[PDB]
Each structure stands twice: as structure tokens, then as C-alpha cells.
Design an enzyme around this catalytic site. Structure first.
Site, PDB file in Angstrom:
ATOM      1  N   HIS A  39       1.301  -1.421   0.376  1.00  0.00           N
ATOM      2  CA  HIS A  39       0.105  -0.247   0.156  1.00  0.00           C
ATOM      3  C   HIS A  39       0.763   1.683   0.075  1.00  0.00           C
ATOM      4  CE1 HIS A  39      -3.269  -2.416   1.029  1.00  0.00           C
ATOM      5  NE2 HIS A  39      -3.145  -3.186   1.632  1.00  0.00           N
ATOM      6  N   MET A  74      -9.755   2.132   0.373  1.00  0.00           N
ATOM      7  CA  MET A  74      -8.718   2.535   0.752  1.00  0.00           C
ATOM      8  C   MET A  74      -8.521   4.468   0.178  1.00  0.00           C
ATOM      9  SD  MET A  74      -5.219   0.737   1.222  1.00  0.00           S
ATOM     10  CE  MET A  74      -4.390   1.897   2.000  1.00  0.00           C
ATOM     11  N   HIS A 132      -7.490  -0.310  -4.854  1.00  0.00           N
ATOM     12  CA  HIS A 132      -7.071  -0.364  -3.593  1.00  0.00           C
ATOM     13  C   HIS A 132      -8.375   1.020  -3.239  1.00  0.00           C
ATOM     14  CE1 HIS A 132      -3.095  -2.066  -2.396  1.00  0.00           C
ATOM     15  NE2 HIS A 132      -3.796  -2.026  -3.849  1.00  0.00           N
ATOM     16  N   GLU A 187     -29.354  24.075  -3.610  1.00  0.00           N
ATOM     17  CA  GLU A 187     -30.641  23.194  -2.939  1.00  0.00           C
ATOM     18  C   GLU A 187     -28.976  21.758  -3.508  1.00  0.00           C
ATOM     19  OE1 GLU A 187     -33.851  21.767  -5.951  1.00  0.00           O
ATOM     20  OE2 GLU A 187     -32.097  23.574  -7.691  1.00  0.00           O
ATOM     21  N   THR A 188     -28.925  21.359  -4.434  1.00  0.00           N
ATOM     22  CA  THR A 188     -28.423  20.530  -4.237  1.00  0.00           C
ATOM     23  C   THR A 188     -26.840  20.591  -5.176  1.00  0.00           C
ATOM     24  OG1 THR A 188     -29.669  18.730  -5.222  1.00  0.00           O
ATOM     25  CG2 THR A 188     -27.718  17.959  -5.848  1.00  0.00           C
ATOM     26  N   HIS A 245     -27.031  17.023  -1.305  1.00  0.00           N
ATOM     27  CA  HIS A 245     -27.455  17.517  -0.887  1.00  0.00           C
ATOM     28  C   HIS A 245     -28.823  17.018   0.452  1.00  0.00           C
ATOM     29  CE1 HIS A 245     -32.097  18.874  -2.105  1.00  0.00           C
ATOM     30  NE2 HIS A 245     -32.230  18.418  -1.239  1.00  0.00           N
ATOM     31  N   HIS A 261      -5.636   9.159  -1.105  1.00  0.00           N
ATOM     32  CA  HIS A 261      -6.031   7.958  -1.038  1.00  0.00           C
ATOM     33  C   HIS A 261      -4.619   7.134  -2.165  1.00  0.00           C
ATOM     34  CE1 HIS A 261      -5.370   8.009  -5.806  1.00  0.00           C
ATOM     35  NE2 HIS A 261      -5.876   9.137  -6.104  1.00  0.00           N
ATOM     36  N   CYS A 262      -4.703   5.356  -1.713  1.00  0.00           N
ATOM     37  CA  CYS A 262      -3.753   4.256  -2.166  1.00  0.00           C
ATOM     38  C   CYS A 262      -3.561   4.461  -3.571  1.00  0.00           C
ATOM     39  CB  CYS A 262      -4.324   3.273  -1.371  1.00  0.00           C
ATOM     40  SG  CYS A 262      -2.856   2.122  -2.007  1.00  0.00           S
ATOM     41  N   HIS A 303     -27.560  12.782  -4.652  1.00  0.00           N
ATOM     42  CA  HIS A 303     -28.544  13.034  -5.032  1.00  0.00           C
ATOM     43  C   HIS A 303     -29.104  12.763  -6.902  1.00  0.00           C
ATOM     44  CE1 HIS A 303     -33.257  14.561  -5.668  1.00  0.00           C
ATOM     45  NE2 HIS A 303     -32.860  15.459  -4.959  1.00  0.00           N
ATOM     46  N   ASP A 308      -1.679   8.730  -1.073  1.00  0.00           N
ATOM     47  CA  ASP A 308      -1.570  10.097  -2.109  1.00  0.00           C
ATOM     48  C   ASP A 308      -2.437  11.173  -1.472  1.00  0.00           C
ATOM     49  OD1 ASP A 308      -0.978   9.367  -5.776  1.00  0.00           O
ATOM     50  OD2 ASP A 308       0.280   8.532  -4.223  1.00  0.00           O
ATOM     51  N   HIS A 358      -3.651  14.614  -2.583  1.00  0.00           N
ATOM     52  CA  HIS A 358      -3.950  15.355  -4.077  1.00  0.00           C
ATOM     53  C   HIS A 358      -3.624  16.477  -3.323  1.00  0.00           C
ATOM     54  CE1 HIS A 358      -7.603  13.145  -6.282  1.00  0.00           C
ATOM     55  NE2 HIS A 358      -6.228  12.911  -5.771  1.00  0.00           N
TER      56      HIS A 358
HETATM   57 CU   LIG Z   1      -4.016  -0.141  -0.130  1.00  0.00          CU
HETATM   58 CU   LIG Z   2      -5.824  10.770  -7.207  1.00  0.00          CU
HETATM   59 CU   LIG Z   3     -34.466  15.856  -3.542  1.00  0.00          CU
END
Ligand SMILES: [Cu+2]
Ligand SMILES: [Cu+2]
Ligand SMILES: [Cu+2]
Ligand SMILES: [Cu+2]
Ligand SMILES: [Cu+2]
Ligand SMILES: [Cu+2]
Lengths: 336, 336, 336
Positions: free
Chosen positions: A92, A147, A142, A276-277, A252, A132-133, A303, A95, A97
Site C-alpha cells: 500500500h 482505501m 485499492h 439545493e444540490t 443534498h 487515497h492509496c 441526489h 497520495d 491531493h
Molecule cells: Cu492500498
Molecule cells: Cu488521485
Molecule cells: Cu430532492
């Protein structure tokens, strides 16, 4: 910023809690830049994802899906100690971001079972970010085995609206949304395996349909309902951090709104208002700020309502307080 | 405001019109806050959604898919009389994304066949918002059977761009986009059913593929074409309100643009400008303002072109006026 | 302008280069408005799109997938000579999302094999914009066979941030992203066809699943990796233009960020900042500006990681310069 300068900086060990809760932190930064320390052990474990007893071999940061939220402030250093115990079967890595260089840290953090590593990066940009891995050649496997997690890089001065007024939440929650790809047998029954690797080929075939069998919050259908429903009170300001490391989502708050939404997850991008969303692309985190105005149960959803109510992507809020008849009233209750 | 102060307010009864049209309203509010009264009868009806005769049991607000557009101004109250006639077979309710509390109104509006209800909410934020039926345990199914629409809450001062300059439309249209999930037989041909319930199991299976069989404007493939094509003229300013209660869409005016687009649908969020293609996440409404500059035929589409041209998500505009050779001209027509 | 004024404007022929490279241009406009002249020949040819010899009958502007980037400034005219050689089998045309009228140009540019056409349009709005072939009744089929590209309409005064400070790139790349829908036999082997039209019916069936078999950059799995990785140096400022003519994508620079992202692709809409992952809806182009701060390999992906790493939507950047340990450091390397 020199090695000497960095070594002179104050350090702070942080104790991480399980999602949707968030570890102790301060919104406004306390003193100058520091090196914030975190430790996560990777647990490879069976998780049951629905009421039919469907299993996933989860690959879990800190043993949870999603992994826990790490909170730092802009220009702090985040120093993670990642551990891969001998009781695991796979390599494993991680990363961020939020980080810059070596694919977000993954190039420098590849650990076999039995190994550990310590990565340090400067949190130069304010916002919520996926981590994330991503082991070369097995990246999506993964990530969709759970992960992934997220971090929040708060501005030193805490949160603000588009025009400079301070925004201070009383509560924060972290919702990690997960797309799962569970193989079925010829009767349409979900399969079980003895080892993570046993499922690889069957899973990859399902992944390629681009159609998840489950879309869930906090690792399972119904995870954030009942005993794990999120709570608030009328008048409380709440921040909802939401991530999805592989697939789009459209959060939402049913019965509520997103008063301020950093849809991109980035605090220097002014937030949207009166939402709203909102929309969070796969591989990103967003955050919404809402002041509750009504008591009662809320559903918090992806939603696409098939994904929410057929596939699992639905959570609840239980909110206490006084009903507001100005905002809403039943003039004539259901009747003949 | 108190009950007494709300009781003292003037009330205006509005007659709803069928989509894509919108009932008479003023862009700038007339007087102070009003209680705006609408009535909708729910009609469970067989509708044909394509030229082949494929039929769906629509669960239809006011007898149409989408339900009609309701228009109020900020701080007006929307008062809805919703009626579920004895001839219907299911319980329904309504959620207003614009509203606050009781799941947008759904917790207070559950009416069985033979019942009615009156819901009032204060329209506290300006924008376009989705409304839809959401009966607990059966939410997505009512929505994808066409039980959704939108409202617009205008700012009391009418529309403005991102820099305080007024935006007055000459006309408005409401394009409700619907994802349909229609069961097929072993020849790949669509199935018909006797009652709404009979279709449930087969439909849910199709729903879970996340792949609609049809994606349509105003209830059917080609509904907004021919003598139902939308119309404009060179120089004319058109607001296009677009909604999708369940699934993402990416509206595009082929030949035109979105001069101002509130992609999130909220008027306090500054509009995007000079848009080719905008994005509306499932569970939201957006709106686009455009001034026509060229005559002729335009296709208004969801710009997944498979969805537009194979699945049904294409409307036309017929536009009158003089061709502008400065903007575009064929220097050399198709020739050997 | 007046008829004589248009007629009097300078005409300038420009030579195109194949993606991801971009022809010579100035960021700041040079002189007044120009009629910028371009020529593209349409090629219909079999291309191999993966490591297993899978074929597509590409329908290719200038012989490439994506078609080449055309670069002009706001209020220039773009004058395209489009040629369809007699060796081709299909009628083609071109729609410019940047243009106004006749469906973006498609109505005026329908050329049979053995025909050519010259279209002029005024580039009134700044931004990156999709162009694509669009023959009535076969629109998505031409587009998903790779018949699409983009253009960039730069502001006369070059790019700026949200505050009006100039953004000047050292390099520009164009990543065109393509969803392909390749038919398979019942054994799951990709089929081959003699002529483009032979694949039509089978291909449309795959298109209707809304599930591409392949999602690629520059026409093929791995086209922008290895020895065809894009390049930069620490301290270099790069603009990455990205288009998807039919289907959503979510670009992500692994190890980097999008410092300024015009997610909508429109320069009059202020750019988002500090982006981890941005979103470009099907039928649009977007553009991201980044200053590289770390050396090494980057992966530029569609961050649905299944599309990226199972389906082909992964590119590389190879970057020279000196590591910055302040930004990132391995405190303890992978160890038992
Ligand atoms: Cu992993
Ligand atoms: Cu990424
Ligand atoms: Cu709705
Ligand atoms: Cu209903
Ligand atoms: Cu073509
Ligand atoms: Cu188009």
C-alpha cells in the site's frame, strides 16, 4: 523555508477519530506554522456493506472506510506515519491531493507488509482534499476497496464567505462516499472470498461496467442512520465535508440547504450560496456550511435518488429544537 | 413574521400552465410579500414517451411530465393545495427543494387516494429549485415515473447579472428533463403494464443499471419539436429554466450559447458567462439567459449526444429574423 | 463593422500541428482583428486504440483524434477550409461551439466525399471551445468515432487571473479525451469491420449502454505516456486545454494542481484556484494553468480511476529540475 527553520518549528501529535467525527482542532490557527503529526495503520479486513451480508475486503486507512479526516492549517506541515503490518497481504501507499511532488506522496510511501514510512509535506493550499492509496498498476482497485479519505487545510484565519465575513461552524462532519463493485454469481447473489487478492479478477470485470453495485457513506448501507445519525440543533452552524475518490456525487441536505458551498473544496475559490444540490467530481472533496432552522429528521443524500435509495447513499441528521411555522406550516393536514 | 402578520398579507391565486410555458408573472415583484396560491391534482396516467408507442404509467403533478413551473418572489409564501384523487392507487407527497423543514414538505404532505393537503412555506432564497414526490421507501420510483417539476423564486428586484446590472427576459421556457427506465422483453422490446404497481419490480431492475432507456424533455422523445418547437426572434432575450430531479444533465443550445448561466440555479450565486455547455447535477434546476443573434433552427440538447440523439434529449427552437453574415457566412458552399 | 471594413481586414494562413502540440500563436494579440485561415482535410482510417490490436474506423479532422487546436483572439474571424476527399465514404461537416448560427456551422458545411467548403465565423467570446462533426441523424456516431477537437479564443490582452493580473504560459498542451464504443462478439473479442458504415448498427447498440469500452487521450491507450509523455521544467508555467465532446470528464494532475482552472472553459468566467480535480461536462472544453514546483513523473488523468487506469484515460508529464524538500520530504523511507 530551510531544513533548519522547519526543525525549529513546534510539533503536535494528533489523535485521529473515526469518521464522520473529526479530531480536535481549532478553526483559527493557534500560533505560527507547525509540523502536525499523524499515524495510521493499514488494516485489511472484511466489512459487511448491506443487510444481505454482502462483504468487501476493505483496504482501510486507520481501519475505517473512509479513512479519518486530518485537519491542518495552511502552511503547516503534515507529517504522516503510515504503517503496513505483517498481518497484511498487499503493498500500500498514500497520495495526498493536497501535496506537491512524487504523485502526492505515493512515489515515496510504497510499503510492503511489515514496513512503515514517514512522509512530510507542506500544506500550501487551503481546502478539503482527497487522499487515497495508489499502487502503480493497481490504483483503482485499492481506491474502490475503500482505501481513501480526506484532509482539511483550513486558512490560518479560519473560514470566510465570498466577501470576507467570518464563518464559524459549531459542528463538523466528514462523509466519505464509496462506490463498491461486488461480484455476483449466476443467481445474482453476491460472492464471498477468503483473501483480498482472490476477488481481484471478478471485481475488475464489475469495475469496467462503470456501474457500482453499492454507493454508500462510511462503508455501508445505513451506516450514518440511527445510532450513527448525525446530530444538530436549530441555530447550530454545521460543516459537512464530503469526499469521493473515484466517482462523481451530488450531495443534498433534504429539508435543508447548502448556505455556503465550496463545491470544488477549495477555500480560495469563493463558495456558492443558497444551494439545493451541489456537485463533487470523482477524485475530489467538497464542503458545505449550513445553519439549521428547523427541527426533525433530515436525509443527507447523493441526489441521484437511485444511488441514494436503491444503492445505499443516504445518511440522516436528527435535529432538536423548536418548529418554525413562518418557514413552513401544514395549513391543512392530509385529509379527505 | 407572526401568524397574524402572514394572515394580513394579500393572497393571489395562480392558474398554472403546462410546460414548456410558464404562468403569467412579473419579473420585478408587485407590492410587498404575498401568499401565492397554487392547486395541483395528481394524475396517475398512461403516457407515450416515443414515436414507437412505448408507454409509461406517469405519476404526474397537474397531469404533466414535468409538473408545471410555479413562480413567486423571494419572501413570498408559496401555498400549495395538493390533491390525490380517489381514482389514483398510490400515496403521494411533495418535496420543495426551495423549502426548509420536514424534508422540503414531504413529511407534511403524505396523502392517500381520496385525500388532499395544503402546505405553506416561505420562499427565503432566490433561484430555480426542483420539486418532487418522495414517499418513504419508494422515493426514486415516483421521481423516475415523472413525478417532479420546478419552481422559480425571483428576486423581488427581478434578475441581475454578476455586477448588479438588470437582466430582463422577453420570454421564459421550462424544460423538464426526465430519465425513464423502461423494462424490455427477451426480444429487447419494451413492456406495457396494466397498473403502476405491476411495473415496479422490472423497473427497479432497470433503474439499478443507472442506464435510462429514454432521456426526454417535456415527457417524450421529440415533444418540443414540430409545431411544439420553442420559438424566438433575433434580438429576443430568452430565459431557459432546465431541471433534472434524478440525474445529471449538460444543456447546450446548438447554434447559440448561454450568455448568463446560473448553473447551480441560485440567483445569489453569480452566473457563468459565454457558456457553450453548462452542467446541472441530478436533483437540481439551472437557468440560462440568451439573446438570439441568428435566425433558423437550433437544437437544445443534453450534450451527451448519445443521450440527445439516441435517447431523446433534444428540443428545437424556430427563430425568425435576418441572417448576420458578420457573425457567420459560407465563404464557399459545399462544392467539388 | 461595415462590409468594407470586414473585407479590408488582414488575412493570415496558419499551419496546424497535431495534438497535444499547438501551432505558433501569440498570447497577446498582434495588431487588430484578423481573418485567421485554417485548412483541414478529413481522413477516414482504421486506427488501433489499445495494446490488444482493437480497431476503430476513425473519422478524423486533419487525420488526428482529437482534431487539432485552432488558436485565435477575441473578435478575430476563424476561416476554415474543410476538405472531404473523394476516397472517403461519408458526408461530414463541422460544428464550432464558439460560433453563432446554423448549428455552429454544421448547416453550412455538409460536404460529400469529393467536396470542400469554406466557413467564416466571428470569434466573439473568449475561451476554449469544442468543435465536432455533426451530420443530421448521425451526430453522436461521428463524434464518438473521434470527429471532434477544440479551439482557443484568447482575450486580445492574453490571460488574466480573477484580479486582472496577467497569466502567461511558457507552454501549452491540448489533451482531447475520447470515449470509444467498440463492439464485441459473444466471446468478448472486439469485432473488426471492412468499412465505417458496417460497424454502425453494432456501435449504436454499444453507445446506448452509455458505457464506453475505452476512454483515451490523443486517440489511444498510452498515447501520451512513456516516450510520448508531455514535458516541463520546475518553474515552467503550463496551460493544459482539455476537451470532451460527448461525455463528462474530471481532469487531475497527479502530484500537481490546477492553480487557475477555467472549468467552464470560458475566460470571462473567473477561474477557480488551487484545484485538486476539475470537471468538464460532455460537450465542452476547459483549461488549467499550473506552475510546476517539483521534478519527476506526473500522471494527468480523468479521475474516475477506473476510466483512467482500466479504460485508458491516463497521460504523463516528465518534469526536470531540483527537488524541493520543503514542499515534500521522505522523513523515513519504506523500511521493515
Ligand atoms: Cu492500498
Ligand atoms: Cu488521485
Ligand atoms: Cu430532492
Ligand atoms: Cu408520487
Ligand atoms: Cu464526420
Ligand atoms: Cu455540440
Amino acid at each position: 523555508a530551510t531544513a533548519a527553520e522547519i526543525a525549529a518549528l513546534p510539533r503536535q501529535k494528533v489523535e485521529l477519530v473515526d469518521p464522520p467525527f473529526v479530531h480536535a482542532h481549532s478553526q483559527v490557527a493557534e500560533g505560527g506554522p507547525k509540523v502536525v503529526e499523524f499515524t495510521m495503520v493499514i488494516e485489511e479486513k472484511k466489512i459487511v456493506i448491506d443487510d444481505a451480508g454482502t462483504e468487501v475486503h476493505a483496504l482501510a486507512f486507520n481501519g475505517t472506510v473512509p479513512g479519518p479526516l486530518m485537519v491542518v492549517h495552511q502552511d503547516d506541515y503534515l507529517e504522516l506515519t503510515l504503517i503496513n503490518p505483517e498481518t497484511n497481504t498487499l503493498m500500500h501507499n498514500i497520495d495526498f491531493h493536497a501535496a506537491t511532488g512524487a504523485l502526492g506522496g505515493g512515489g515515496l510511501t510504497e510499503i510492503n507488509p511489515g514496513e512503515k514510512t514517514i512522509l512530510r509535506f507542506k500544506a500550501t493550499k487551503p481546502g478539503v482534499f482527497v487522499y487515497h492509496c495508489a499502487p502503480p498498476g493497481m490504483v483503482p482497485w485499492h481506491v474502490v476497496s475503500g482505501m481513501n479519505g480526506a484532509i482539511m487545510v483550513l486558512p490560518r484565519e479560519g473560514l470566510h464567505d465570498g466577501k470576507g465575513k467570518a464563518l464559524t461552524y459549531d459542528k463538523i462532519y466528514y462523509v466519505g462516499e464509496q462506490d463498491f463493485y461486488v461480484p455476483r454469481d449466476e443467481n445474482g447473489k453476491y460472492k464471498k472470498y477468503e483473501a483480498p487478492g482472490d476477488a481481484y479478477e471478478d471485481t475488475v470485470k464489475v469495475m469496467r461496467t462503470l456501474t457500482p453495485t453499492h454507493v454508500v457513506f462510511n462503508g455501508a448501507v445505513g451506516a450514518l442512520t440511527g445510532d450513527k445519525a448525525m446530530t444538530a440543533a436549530v441555530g447550530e452552524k454545521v460543516l459537512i465535508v464530503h469526499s469521493q475518490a473515484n466517482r462523481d456525487t451530488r450531495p443534498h441536505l433534504i429539508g435543508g440547504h447548502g448556505d455556503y458551498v465550496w463545491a470544488t473544496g477549495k477555500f480560495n475559490t469563493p463558495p456558492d450560496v443558497d444551494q439545493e444540490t451541489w456537485f463533487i467530481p470523482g477524485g475530489a472533496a467538497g464542503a458545505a456550511f449550513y445553519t439549521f432552522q428547523q427541527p426533525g429528521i433530515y436525509a443527507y443524500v447523493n441526489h441521484n435518488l437511485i444511488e441514494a435509495f436503491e444503492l445505499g447513499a443516504a445518511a440522516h441528521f436528527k435535529v432538536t429544537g423548536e418548529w418554525n411555522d413562518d418557514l413552513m406550516t401544514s395549513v391543512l393536514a392530509p385529509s379527505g
